[PDB]
Design an enzyme around this catalytic site. Structure first.
Site, PDB file in Angstrom:
ATOM      1  N   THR A   1       0.987  -0.478  -0.069  1.00  0.00           N
ATOM      2  CA  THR A   1      -0.071   0.022  -0.309  1.00  0.00           C
ATOM      3  C   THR A   1       1.079   1.377   0.455  1.00  0.00           C
ATOM      4  O   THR A   1       1.780   1.307   0.454  1.00  0.00           O
ATOM      5  CB  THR A   1      -1.013   0.035   1.173  1.00  0.00           C
ATOM      6  OG1 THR A   1      -2.037   1.147   1.849  1.00  0.00           O
ATOM      7  CG2 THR A   1      -0.295  -0.129   2.317  1.00  0.00           C
ATOM      8  N   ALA A  42      -4.201  -2.380   7.850  1.00  0.00           N
ATOM      9  CA  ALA A  42      -5.451  -2.252   7.080  1.00  0.00           C
ATOM     10  C   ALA A  42      -6.225  -1.362   8.553  1.00  0.00           C
ATOM     11  O   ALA A  42      -6.868  -0.867   8.634  1.00  0.00           O
ATOM     12  CB  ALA A  42      -6.041  -2.829   6.120  1.00  0.00           C
TER      13      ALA A  42
END
Lengths: 199, 248, 231, 206, 213, 240, 201, 239, 237
Positions: free
Chosen positions: G1, G49
């Site tokens: 990410t 996350a």
């Protein structure tokens, strides 16, 4: 690591440090300030393990400012030094240690300028000059063979420029800019930083 | 009535228990302190002067709190002892954290805060101890501070608490020359005040205790006058009274 | 009564707790607040009861934003009202956080009553304030009334405060199920003027509305004059 | 329970029409040594439910006292309600799962089976808390050795008889004796039916 | 000296339909190499329009189901309204995190009908991360399952086609075949197949066979 | 007056008034008699059905402290139920920490200490229910202990707690409990209870019996309905 | 990410990838790295996350409560400090955290970065995640204070692509958000493949 | 018989202990506070301290933060504790949130502490009403009054302590936009308002003047003397 | 007298007067009737509206799928007891996966209520609960008065004007056992209607019906839902 270097003048203390904050690959910010305004005539420079330094100073600052207001008279630089260190000793053995190396410098009307060296183990020391971080071994000698007990303002800045100039020569990474502040009878003032073309 | 407990407010808005304590502070023996340009002093009256009582401490009313502070006492004995112990603890705690002497007013404010906390939280009776503070600090130098059972302190140049505090304070106001008193003159005024503040005539040296704060070569020596110098001062006051009556 | 009414822990011969009723009486000393629930939305009109021209009119809070969709009207002790309103805001935010949805007015009223219920159940005194909760939820516009005792019940048009009795009696006469927001607001302003000591103007009343789709809208200085013009 | 000291062999149980039967060895083997050889690893909880478990007998013994008092309280109220075999199973699942969460779980793989209101119940809550319902269950090694056999009998014919159940376990523990280094030739058999719960034994093999 | 987590296999796959949602799994309970039991459904019914399937640590599986069923009762009781599938998505995000540093070793995918009668599939990280999805599978075959739906359902990695809507029978035929291919291509699931379909009328469950070796 | 508002205030003559008030409260309830057979202990309590809407067994005063211990509380039913819960807790703890059934003497002593601990504090009030503990064991025979609010508890051959305690004792002393068995003693208990009943001041009652002894393999259980009627038949035979 | 955000004379632009991977597996390609905490305040994603969503949610709650209690929206600087303190007390206990809190307040549009380590710094350009270094290599060369809205937009989309191309852990889709006085607006969400064709020629 | 407990409601729903506590505020030196466009003023009356005592330790106007100042009435013992707790709260709020404590926030915390102290027995209510004024709004002046009960209010100009009614009446009839259009006129208004309550000479009025992005400036007696001379000149002009 | 202030003070006659007053607290609320047939336990309550245009107060609360209550007393204590019973039911479901028996829950309620009546610090729970539930032993209709004593009753009725309902239930106890859901509900409605004054009538806006049966979960009928049951009731003579 960052750089905390200070020179104790005859009636002033000039403390300087970099403005480069990097996260393990790259300088995240270039105008980051790492010297904190303890009070009107006392300054704090906290380096060391990330996260801890930014807040421990803010806590030390809130309690140094808190004392300045609940009493009407600002804490003496030696008292501030003992307190900043005192907090570290209590928390060093606690379960939330503060792995921060800090430098404290300020001016007291009764006694004069002072510059205290703070180790991450919370060990206090009054020294005419000191350096923090890895670069300490690189410029601490520069002060040793160059310092004079009566460094004037103009010669004081030149010495750090030589101190900073040498750092740019050996230090592996980049420190484009550094912070420079002066503590004197009339207060703490800001000076210009340094830069060097390489084209 | 509205004096069952400290927490209760009278309709007019008066802490009746606190006022009762501040009135009861009058039962305590007379103590006073005059601030002089070179130092400050304290004077106390030994109410218990029985021949069978051995004087072992010589400081029943005058206690040393720090290397640069001392505070006389007036009020309950147990409350006075607790307050003096807390004062010493606060001063030494401040010294340990900051590594410099407490600037006097800090200790006074800490003790006043403790007393206020006692007068606020229910289930605790107000500290019926009003104690004078003396000391020197780098910020303001010699200072004399008054503490009441309600925690309301205040800077003062010369005050007396305990028996006949009103007369002593009034006649200190009458004859106190601001900014022109030396330690010798301060002691003379203190002896003069103590002579008529107490009913006992001749102001026996054994019945009066005087301690003086001086600033010598940066040491802040607290000296409790020995009986010899107290007797000398009493004799000096007697001769001064004779000289004054000479006009008669 | 003098021996049984000195604590919420004592039961009167009737079985009444002679301390909650005193809380209701205390709520009876606040400024009148009116809330009308109509199909189009919920309206809240109150009395400013300004004590001095120097005081800032916005400083005193009668209608507050508990959440973007639920408005609260205060009538009674300022401190209890503020604590309950803050608790309602916190409960609404907690429900949004944990359940990612806007808590229903019934749920927020239940949450506020829970705090209004710990009036001495060993984890003080009853919260001497009555809150009129008005907002729109998945069930449509709604208005809920709360008393210091913790009893909450849905109300179509409830009046609470100094003029509760007369305002409620007139509301019963001037309320019908088919009212629209404009007519409901006009009727509420008329009733407040009827039960108001001082002549109604834009500086002594704050009017709040919460319609579906739109959010809690508190009429501003310019807006209030527009509505008071005709009434 | 972080290092078991006295452990247990496999525990076997196969459900039939009209009840359920379980069996277990009587060899408490501290390490590799047969420390004790007269212990019971299957005791009844109530008239319509019985249980037996492997692992630390001391840990299981603690469970015996808990269930006994926990079970005994059931009839003291005298309301008629009694912990159903699922009821004990549900308590067990939360009992060990709660204990495991604190890093002190019972190293005792239990099996609970019983007969309630015309239906048989055969649950197994492992030393950690896993639990499921199977027509036939074996703890520890029995899952490796006897458990595969029981599917074959159940797969072709999910209905069994008490005698068919009796020897089936015998052909189950017999193979346990041959291919196991911790088994013992003295086991009890627990039969639960409408008439109640009965425990008998031990039994040997050729 | 002690592993508090034991892998118990299983695969959960949730497909979001226009007017229905699909949840199914394998009833093969196994740890390491052994087979614990061949009838242990990973499909769990929570509400008329909300079905939760949990794969992974079965012990944490049943507890997370019990807690969610309990939390469902409390929310229904307090607000006099059965919580929508969207709310359950938020709750599991919170409840899962509440045990962060002792993670709930369960991968949960929620399949239910939203307010507008439209499908809702949520993918849960065992530590709290969640996000709405139209189709998703997890457990062990999650690697072997996701790509196929992208090709068929998502039209992913293909060209010159019309992205036709998914239908009940067509979707079920898709899910039936996809799970079958998972059993053949993957040996970590099988011995049974439990499929739960949640629609406007309610939920339905069907079971099929798989291999024994 | 003045010294009787709290249980921690000794009366000027040296008597804790609240304890006596609790004793009066227990005296204000219905009778409950425990008679010790030669081979068991029998409990019988007249349970008045305050209204016809009750479910013939509601708020029963016979409580099973443990498997072998029967309790026959009489007085304030809430306090009796709390005492039964505490007695069950003590029995469970004794069994867990020692592994064998808590002797009736020790259970009675511990429960009496718990009861007495509630007459020493100002923040708590004495229990308003007096209870008798009964049990049988071949190892230690049959024991019947009665503990009142005061906390005193010594064994009894036969005791009655309630309104007609004296009337029950008058016709219980005329019974030979030293030798009789727990079979005819149940009929005797039914008759004695039926004798001690106003029947003009109390509208109606539902006799409930209990026993623990050799005939019950040492466990305490509700007297079987088949033989409970026989006791009722004998009581009816007795004219009173 | 990996996510990128920067300020300029026109405002602050935040864009991020949408690729979540658990080691070798590509967990999902729809995860929204930019979290819509508040109407006038945006937060980015990095590392864990679940860590971001919850702790951004907690800051989202405090900002909402602060707005109601004080009747004035929280300063973007205020939120930055709050998260740094709100996340410290778990420092070194197993927490991973990275995000830039971007917003426009009465003190001018500001951007701050908060990490599990406990660092909170200001600046005009930022990029967190695996592709941070790759994302940087582009935006330094193409960062000017006076970039216009349309030309600035391309820089963010291009910056992420060069990051996701040089990075083997970021991908999926790219989301772009613009924060203004009225708040933030969903600028565009273009997949990597679409970006390949546009940038290929 | 309902005025002997804080948590006991009178038959007419009055928390009588709080009302009695306000009486303590009614017995203090008057404090007048008026806020201008670029100035906030906190008027105070000195009590003509004893001839032989120092007035440095009788500070009644104290600053909680670098830009928020409060003037209190009532008993000094409670006012000092409230001031100390307000300072600690401001330094903690700065620590958690770098943004400096707003005047609204400090007033809210003071009110919360007072309410917590007036919520249960064994805790006497704070008998000091605090006028908290500060430019902490970053470009907006604000003034607040914290009653001993626990409720605060925003006031353009309010009076506390002895003579509060008269000073409030004067302020209402004289505080107009033309009045506070400049800092000097705001200070003159403060002096005029405090003159009616405190009839005496110099040193009997202590004025704390704070300007935008500045520090507290306790006006020296001369400056108050200059302003009183100006006000006397204005009165002479009126006559 | 002076023994009328605390629950820890014993009156000379042997009564804890505070418990008597807590019991009296029930009669201040609306009348409620709870009754059970062989397979159903239906409880009918009357709802009182504070004002003509205010929703009628909830009186039949939901505890679990098999345990229903009617609150006739303090709203505060009624809600607290309802929450505690909800927690107990949820705990029983979580730990045992089995419906917590109504008798055991009633015993727990009695035990929890006894403590406030024995130790100073809080008033007795001034709410009378009519617990209706279905378990392995059939329907149960308990009443938990504030005195900490609960009575297992076939058809109890608490609250103001509840004597008429109790008398009617005593009269028609026999038919209750062998009655269907409709007849049980109609008898309960008749019992409630007896309590009301002459002028008031059992309207759809002030009657709440709760039923738990063999295969029917608890259901609370309010507003129109009560209409199917209300219609057909014999007009009061």
């Amino acid at each position: 690591m960052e750089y905390l270097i200070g020179i104790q003048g005859p009636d002033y203390v000039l403390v300087a440090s970099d403005r480069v904050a990097a996260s393990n690959i790259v300088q995240m910010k270039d105008d980051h300030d790492k010297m904190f305004k303890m009070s009107e005539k006392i300054l704090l420079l906290c380096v060391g393990e990330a996260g801890d330094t930014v807040q421990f100073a803010e806590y030390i600052q809130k309690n140094v400012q808190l004392y300045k207001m609940r009493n009407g008279y600002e804490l003496s630089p030696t008292a501030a030094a003992n307190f900043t260190r005192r907090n570290l000793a209590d928390c060093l053995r606690s379960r939330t240690p503060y792995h921060v190396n800090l430098l404290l410098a300020g001016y007291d009307e009764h006694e004069g300028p002072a510059l205290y060296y703070m180790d991450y183990l919370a060990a206090l020391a009054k020294a005419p000059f000191a350096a923090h971080g890895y670069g300490a071994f690189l410029t601490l000698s520069i002060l040793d063979r160059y310092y004079t007990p009566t460094i004037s303002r103009e010669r004081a800045v030149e010495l750090l420029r030589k101190c900073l100039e040498e750092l740019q020569k050996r230090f592996i990474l980049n420190l484009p800019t550094f912070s420079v502040r002066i503590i004197d009878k009339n207060g703490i003032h800001d000076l210009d930083n340094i830069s060097f073309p390489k084209q | 009535r509205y004096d069952s407990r400290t927490t209760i407010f009278s309709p007019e808005g008066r802490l009746y228990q606190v006022e009762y304590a501040m009135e009861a502070i009058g039962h305590a023996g007379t103590c006073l302190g005059i601030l002089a340009n070179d130092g400050v002093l304290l004077a106390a009256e030994r109410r218990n002067i029985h021949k069978l009582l051995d004087e072992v401490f010589f400081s029943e009313k005058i206690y040393k709190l720090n290397e640069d502070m001392a505070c006389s006492v007036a009020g309950i004995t147990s409350d006075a002892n607790v307050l003096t112990n807390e004062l010493r603890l606060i001063a030494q705690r401040y010294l340990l954290q900051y590594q410099e002497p407490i600037p006097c007013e800090q200790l006074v404010t800490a003790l006043c805060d403790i007393k206020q906390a006692y007068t606020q939280f229910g289930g605790k009776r107000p500290f019926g101890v009003s104690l004078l503070y003396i000391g020197w600090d780098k910020h303001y130098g010699f200072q004399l501070y008054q503490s009441d059972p309600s925690g309301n302190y205040g800077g003062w140049k010369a005050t007396c608490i305990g028996n006949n505090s009103a007369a002593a304070v009034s006649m200190l106001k009458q004859d106190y020359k601001e900014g022109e008193m030396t330690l010798k003159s301060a002691l003379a005024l203190a002896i003069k005040v103590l002579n008529k503040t107490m009913d006992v005539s001749k102001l026996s040296a054994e019945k009066v205790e005087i301690a003086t704060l001086t600033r010598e070569n940066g040491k802040t020596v607290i000296r409790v006058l020995k009986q010899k110098e107290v007797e000398q001062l009493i004799k000096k006051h007697e001769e001064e009274e004779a000289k004054a009556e000479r006009e008669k | 009564r003098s021996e049984y009414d000195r604590g919420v822990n004592t039961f009167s011969p009737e079985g009444r707790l002679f301390q909650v009723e005193y809380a209701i009486e205390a709520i009876k000393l606040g400024s009148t607040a009116i809330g009308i629930q109509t199909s189009e939305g919920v309206c809240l009109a109150v009395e400013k009861r300004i004590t001095s021209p120097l005081m800032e009119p916005s400083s005193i809070e009668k209608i507050v934003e508990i959440d973007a969709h639920i408005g609260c009207a205060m009538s009674g002790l300022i401190k209890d009202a503020k604590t309950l309103i803050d608790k309602a805001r916190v409960e609404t935010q907690n429900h949004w956080f944990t359940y990612n949805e806007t808590m229903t007015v019934e749920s927020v009223t239940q949450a506020v009553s829970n705090l209004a219920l710990q009036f001495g159940e060993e984890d003080s005194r009853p919260f001497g304030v009555a809150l009129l909760f008005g907002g729109v939820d998945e069930k449509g516009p709604q208005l809920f009334h709360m008393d210091p005792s913790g009893t909450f019940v849905q109300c179509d048009a409830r009046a609470i405060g100094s003029a509760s009795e007369g305002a409620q009696s007139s509301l019963q006469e001037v309320y019908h199920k088919s009212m629209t927001l404009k007519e409901a607001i006009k009727s509420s302003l008329i009733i407040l003027k009827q039960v108001m000591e001082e002549k109604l103007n834009a500086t002594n009343i704050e009017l709040a509305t919460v319609q579906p789709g739109q959010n809690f809208h508190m009429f501003t200085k310019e807006e209030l004059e527009e509505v008071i013009k005709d009434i | 329970t972080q290092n078991p000291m006295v452990t247990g062999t496999s525990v076997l149980g196969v459900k039939f029409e009209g009840g359920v039967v379980i069996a277990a060895d009587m060899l408490g083997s501290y390490g590799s040594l047969a420390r004790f050889r007269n212990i019971s690893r299957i005791m009844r909880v109530n008239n319509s439910t019985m249980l037996g478990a492997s692992g630390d007998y001391a840990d299981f013994q603690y469970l015996k006292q808990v269930l006994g008092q926990m079970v005994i309280d059931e009839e003291l109220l005298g309301d008629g309600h009694s912990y159903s075999p699922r009821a004990i199973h549900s308590w067990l699942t939360r009992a060990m799962y709660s204990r495991r969460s604190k890093m002190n779980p019972l190293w005792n793989t239990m099996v609970i089976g019983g007969y309630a209101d015309g239906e048989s119940f055969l649950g197994y809550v492992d030393m950690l808390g896993v639990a499921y319902e199977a027509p036939s269950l074996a703890t520890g090694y029995g899952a490796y050795l006897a458990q595969p056999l029981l599917r074959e009998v159940l797969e072709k014919q999910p209905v069994l008889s008490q005698t068919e159940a009796r020897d089936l376990v015998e052909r189950c523990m017999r193979v346990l004796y041959y291919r196991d280094a911790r088994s013992y030739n003295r086991f009890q058999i627990a039969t639960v039916t409408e008439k109640g719960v009965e425990i008998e034994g031990p039994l040997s093999t050729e | 000296r002690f592993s508090p987590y034991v892998f118990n296999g299983g695969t959960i796959l949730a497909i979001a339909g226009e007017d229905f949602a699909i949840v199914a799994s394998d009833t093969r309970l196994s740890e390491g190499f052994s087979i614990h039991t061949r009838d242990s459904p990973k499909c769990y019914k929570l509400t008329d329009k909300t079905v939760i399937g949990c794969s992974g640590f079965h012990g944490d599986c049943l507890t997370l189901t019990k807690i969610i069923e309990a939390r469902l009762k409390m929310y229904k009781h307090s607000n006099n309204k059965a919580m929508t599938t969207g709310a359950i998505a938020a709750m599991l995000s919170t409840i899962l995190y509440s045990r962060r540093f002792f993670p709930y070793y369960v991968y949960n995918i929620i399949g239910g009908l939203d307010e507008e009668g439209k499908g809702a599939v949520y993918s849960f990280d065992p530590v709290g991360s969640y996000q709405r999805d139209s189709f998703k599978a997890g457990g062990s075959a999650s690697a072997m399952l996701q790509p196929l739906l992208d090709n068929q359902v998502g039209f992913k990695n293909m060209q010159n086609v019309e992205h036709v809507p998914l239908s009940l029978d067509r979707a079920m035929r898709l899910v039936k075949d996809v799970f079958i291919s998972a059993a053949e291509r993957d040996v970590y699931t099988g011995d049974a197949l439990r499929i739960c379909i949640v629609t406007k009328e309610g939920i339905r469950e069907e079971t099929v066979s798989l291999r024994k070796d | 007056t003045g010294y009787d508002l709290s249980a921690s205030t000794f009366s000027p003559d040296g008597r804790v008034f609240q304890v006596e008030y609790a004793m009066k409260a227990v005296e204000n309830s219905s009778t409950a008699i425990g008679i010790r057979c030669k081979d068991g202990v029998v409990f019988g309590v007249e349970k008045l059905v305050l209204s016809k809407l009750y479910e013939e067994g509601s708020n029963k005063r016979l409580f099973n402290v443990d498997r072998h211990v029967g309790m026959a509380v009489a007085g304030l039913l809430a306090d009796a139920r709390s005492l039964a819960d505490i007695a069950r807790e003590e029995a469970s703890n004794f069994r867990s920490n020692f592994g064998y059934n808590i002797p009736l003497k020790h259970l009675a002593d511990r429960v009496a200490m718990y009861v007495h601990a509630y007459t020493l504090y100002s923040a708590v009030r004495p229990f308003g229910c007096s209870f008798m503990l009964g049990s049988y064991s071949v190892n230690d025979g049959a024991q019947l202990y009665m503990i009142d609010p005061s906390g005193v508890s010594y064994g009894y051959w036969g005791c009655a707690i309630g309104k007609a305690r004296q009337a029950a004792k008058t016709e219980i002393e005329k019974l030979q409990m030293k030798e009789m068995t727990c079979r005819d003693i149940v009929k005797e208990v039914a008759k004695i209870i039926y004798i001690v009943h106003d029947e003009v001041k109390d509208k109606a009652f539902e006799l409930e019996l209990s026993w623990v002894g050799e005939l019950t393999n040492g466990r305490h259980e509700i007297v079987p309905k088949d033989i409970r009627e026989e006791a009722e038949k004998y009581a009816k035979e007795s004219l009173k | 990410t990996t996510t990128l955000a920067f300020k300029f004379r026109h405002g602050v632009i935040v864009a991020a990838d949408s690729r979540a991977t658990a080691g070798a597996y590509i967990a999902s390609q729809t995860v929204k790295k930019v979290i819509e905490i508040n109407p006038y305040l945006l937060g980015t994603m990095a590392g864990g996350a679940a860590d971001c969503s919850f702790w951004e949610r907690l800051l989202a709650r405090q900002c909402r409560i602060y707005e109601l209690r004080n009747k004035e929206r929280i300063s973007v600087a205020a939120a930055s400090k709050l998260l740094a303190n709100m996340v410290y007390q778990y420092k070194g206990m197993g927490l991973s955290m990275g995000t830039m809190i971007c917003g426009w307040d009465k003190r001018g549009p500001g951007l701050y970065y908060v990490d599990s380590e406990g660092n909170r710094i200001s600046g005009a350009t930022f990029s967190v995640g695996s592709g941070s270094v790759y994302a940087y290599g582009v935006m330094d060369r193409g960062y000017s204070y006076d970039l216009e809205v349309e030309q600035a937009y391309d820089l963010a989309r291009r910056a992420i692509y060069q990051a996701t191309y040089r990075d083997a852990y970021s991908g999926g889709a790219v989301n772009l958000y613009h924060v203004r006085e009225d708040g933030w607006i969903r600028v565009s969400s273009d997949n990597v493949a679409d970006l390949h064709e546009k940038y290929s020629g | 018989s309902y005025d002997r407990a804080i948590t006991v409601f009178s038959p007419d729903g009055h928390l009588f202990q709080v009302e009695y506590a306000q009486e303590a505020v009614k017995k203090g030196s008057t404090a007048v506070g008026v806020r201008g466009r670029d100035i906030v003023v906190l008027g105070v009356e000195k009590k003509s301290v004893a001839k032989l005592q120092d007035e440095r330790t009788v500070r009644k106007i104290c600053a909680l933060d670098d830009n928020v100042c409060m003037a209190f009435a009532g008993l000094t013992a409670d006012a000092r504790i409230v001031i100390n707790r307000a300072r600690v709260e401001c330094q903690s709020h700065r620590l958690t949130v770098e943004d400096p404590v707003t005047v609204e926030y400090i007033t809210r915390y003071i009110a919360s502490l007072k309410q917590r102290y007036t919520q249960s027995n064994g805790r006497r209510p704070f008998g000091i009403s605090a006028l908290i004024v500060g430019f902490d709004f970053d470009g907006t002046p604000r003034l607040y009054q914290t009653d001993p009960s626990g409720t605060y209010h925003a006031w353009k100009a309010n009076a506390i302590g002895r003579g509060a009614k008269s000073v409030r009446e004067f302020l209402e009839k004289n505080y107009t936009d033309e009045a506070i259009e400049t800092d000097d006129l705001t200070i003159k208004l403060v002096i005029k308002a405090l003159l009616e309550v405190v009839q005496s000479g110099g040193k009997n009025i202590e004025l704390a003047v704070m300007r935008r992005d500045q520090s507290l400036k306790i006006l020296n007696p001369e400056e108050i003397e200059k302003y009183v001379v100006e006000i006397e000149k204005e009165k002479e002009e009126n006559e | 007298n002076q023994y009328d202030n605390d629950v820890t003070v014993w009156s000379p006659q042997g009564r804890i007067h505070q418990i008597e007053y807590a019991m009296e607290a029930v009669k201040q609320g609306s009348a409620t009737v709870g009754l059970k047939s062989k397979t159903h336990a239906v409880l009918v309550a009357l709802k009182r509206a504070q004002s003509e245009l205010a929703a009628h107060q909830k009186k039949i609360l939901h505890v679990d799928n098999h345990i229903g209550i009617s609150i006739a007393g303090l709203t505060a204590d009624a809600r607290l007891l309802c929450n505690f019973m909800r927690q107990e039911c949820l705990d029983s479901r979580f730990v045992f996966d089995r419906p917590l028996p109504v008798s055991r829950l009633v015993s727990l309620i009695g035990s929890k209520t006894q403590i406030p009546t024995q130790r100073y610090g809080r008033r007795p729970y001034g709410v009378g609960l009519l617990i209706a539930g279905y378990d392995d032993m059939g329907p149960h209709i308990f009443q938990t008065c504030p005195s900490a004593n609960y009575f297992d009753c076939r058809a109890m009725s608490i609250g103001a004007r509840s004597q008429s309902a109790r008398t009617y239930l005593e009269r028609h106890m026999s038919e209750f056992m062998e009655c269907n859901l409709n007849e049980l509900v109609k008898h309960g409605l008749r019992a409630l209607r007896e309590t009301l004054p002459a002028e008031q009538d059992l309207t759809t806006k002030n009657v709440s019906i709760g039923i738990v049966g063999k295969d029917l979960e608890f259901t609370i009928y309010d507003d129109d839902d009560v209409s199917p049951f209300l219609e057909g009731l014999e007009e009061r003579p």
